[PDB]
Each structure stands twice: as C-alpha cells, then as structure tokens.
From Swiss-Prot:
Monomer; active form. Homodimer; inactive form. Interacts with CNTN3, CNTN4, CNTN5 and CNTN6. It comes from Homo sapiens. Possesses tyrosine phosphatase activity. It comes from the Eukaryota. The active site is at residue 223. It is found in: Membrane. The gene is PTPRG. Belongs to the protein-tyrosine phosphatase family. Receptor class 5 subfamily. This is Receptor-type tyrosine-protein phosphatase gamma. Residues 23-282 form the Tyrosine-protein phosphatase domain. Substrate binds at residues 191, 223-229, 267. Found in a variety of tissues.
Length: 285
C-alpha cells in the first residue's frame, strides 16, 4: 500500500544504502511477481503472428492485449493481433497502450490501432537505430503524407527541443473522418543504461502527460520492445499524478500490478532506480 511522500523520500535513502541492497531486493520481487500466475500469450505465440513480434521473448498477454477489428476474408482469424497491451494509470484503467516500436510489416496494424482506439498522443522513447541495432522502423511521414492501409497520415508541424521532438499529424481514415495525433519523441535516451540526469525526462513526461485531452483514448507509449523505457515512463507519469492528487507514492505496488498486464515493464534494476531518482527530483523541485 501507498506511503506518504515524506516516508518515500527517506525510503529512497534506505534503498540506496548498503551498496543498493534494498533496490536489488525490490527489483527481484518485481521480477518474480507473476511467476505463479500462468499468464498466457497464445496469440503472440501463434505461428501466424510470429512476423508481427519484434522480439521473440517479448509477448502480449492475452487478457490485456489490444485487439484489432478482424478484417473480412482470407486470414481474417489472426488479423486481430498486434503486440500491444492496455496498461493502467493512476486511478484510470487502461490509461495506456504499451507497445513495441512498429515493424514495416505492422505499420498498417499500428495506425489501425491508433484509429480504432481513438488514441491522440503517441509517446516514443527510442531512436530508430541505436549503436548499430535497429530499434524501430519509421512509421510516420518524413514530409508530406504517407498511406498505411486506410489511414493517411500527414505531417503538420515539428517542434525541436534539446531532448525531444514533437510532431503533429493529421490522420484521415479513407473509409470514414480526420483526427489530430501528436507524437512526443524522446531523442536523448543513452544507448546503454539510463539517462544521467532525470530532469529532461521529467520535463518530457510532464509535457507529454499534459497533452492528454479529456474523453480521448489511451495514450500509446512505445520504445523498442515496449517494456523497459515504456514501463519507466508509465510508472513515472502515474506516480507523479499520485503525488499530485494524494501526496503519496506506491512505486513497488503499482509496478507489481502493471507486470500483470505486460511482461517486463521496467525491464532493468537501473530503470527501477531511475524511477526513484526522477520522482525524488520531482518532489524536491
């Protein structure tokens, strides 16, 4: 259960103490927290869906997976699949869709999901290629328009900040009519480990979070696998909201809960520590 901000701040000092022993214990607990739950991901594992997964070991649990409307005709059965899950936010079920960086073979699925779920904000926390590893394919028009199945995406504006870029698109469903989608793209996450300074990430979280408008669909959050940095964002954003609303915090409880909705959310102990670093800076700022 939640603890007051004052207690949380001291708890961080305790977690760091003794060569970070407490952070290691908490993280192991997270890693083991769904071990006995027998959570299935049959759809992710289906041979027909194999090419739709960026990473063989990164699944979308069946009970929380985002489903695409099936397409009529041949191979309709597995046309409902995307590697993506609903994930809760602070006091809001299904506040996010956590998903992998789309593949060229999944661009149509990705934009169809955006249309069908009424998503208005995309949070992207990766570069396309990082230290020679392809992490995500470019699913948006560099300029003008690109067509992804029945969704035509038009670039309207690009605003460049030191640590992130904001791209506004107009999208049109050729079978419907037009909607605004804003992509908050974080461009300075290091190729290895976590950012040295939490401040630019906090700023990115605050601004991208503030852009969520009432009565819209879940905010789409993705990185490469859609678990490590994606989980990190989700925990930070949710805990900031909790602190604002209640002056309490529940990082470990909240993270254990969302592990039930998508595998490996907050993938590394370094990310788990970074969450605390970021929340401490927010509290002190």
């Amino acid at each position: 259960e939640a603890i007051p901000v004052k207690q949380f701040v001291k708890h961080i000092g305790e977690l760091y103490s003794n060569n970070q022993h407490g952070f290691s214990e908490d993280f192991e607990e997270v890693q083991r927290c769904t071990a006995d739950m027998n959570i299935t991901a049959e759809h992710s594992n289906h041979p027909e869906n194999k090419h739709k997964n960026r990473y063989i070991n990164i699944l979308a649990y069946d009970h929380s997976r985002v489903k695409l409307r099936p397409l009529p005709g041949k191979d309709s059965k597995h046309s409902d699949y995307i590697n993506a899950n609903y994930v809760d936010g602070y006091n809001k079920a299904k506040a996010y869709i956590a998903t992998q960086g789309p593949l060229k073979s999944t661009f149509e699925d990705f934009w169809r999901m955006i249309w069908e779920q009424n998503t208005g904000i995309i949070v992207m926390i990766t570069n396309l290629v990082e230290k020679g590893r392809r992490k995500c394919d470019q699913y948006w028009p560099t300029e003008n328009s690109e067509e992804y199945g029945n969704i035509i995406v038009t670039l309207k504006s690009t605003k460049i900040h030191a640590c992130y870029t904001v791209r506004r698109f107009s999208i049109r469903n050729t079978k419907v009519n037009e909607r605004v989608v804003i992509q908050y793209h974080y461009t300075q996450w290091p190729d290895m480990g976590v950012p040295e300074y939490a401040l630019p990430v906090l700023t990115f979280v605050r601004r991208s979070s503030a852009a969520r408008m009432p009565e819209t669909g879940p905010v789409l959050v993705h990185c490469s696998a859609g678990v490590g940095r994606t989980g990190t964002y989700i925990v930070i954003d949710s805990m900031l909201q909790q602190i604002k609303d209640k002056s309490t915090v529940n990082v470990l409880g909240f993270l254990k809960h969302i592990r039930t909705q998508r595998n490996y959310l907050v993938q590394t102990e370094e990310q788990y520590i970074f969450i605390h670093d970021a929340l401490l800076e927010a509290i002190l700022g």
